[PDB]
């Protein structure tokens, strides 16, 4: 498969402006999971980086 989503099981760790923040039980579409920790994605229509360690993808 190909993981490319960010499902937050807990709050968001986005402390920066160039990042993106999600909430508990949320689905996010990742645009670039290439990285060893921080991946660049977007929630709904908001673009920003997120913690790939805090949340995990969702293969649907």
């Amino acid at each position: 498969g190909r993981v490319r989503w960010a499902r937050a099981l807990y709050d968001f760790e986005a402390l920066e402006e160039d990042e993106l923040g999600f909430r508990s039980g949320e689905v996010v579409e990742v645009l670039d999971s290439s990285n060893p920790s921080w991946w660049t994605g977007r929630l709904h229509n908001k673009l920003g980086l997120f913690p790939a360690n805090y949340v995990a993808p969702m293969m649907r």
């Binding site: 760790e13 920066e16 670039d32 990285n35 060893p36 921080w38 660049t40 980086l49 913690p51 805090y54």
Partner: peptide, 11 residues
Amino acid sequence: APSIDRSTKPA
């Protein structure tokens, strides 16, 4: 508790 470091952001 997942710990993320911003010192490794997409670079």
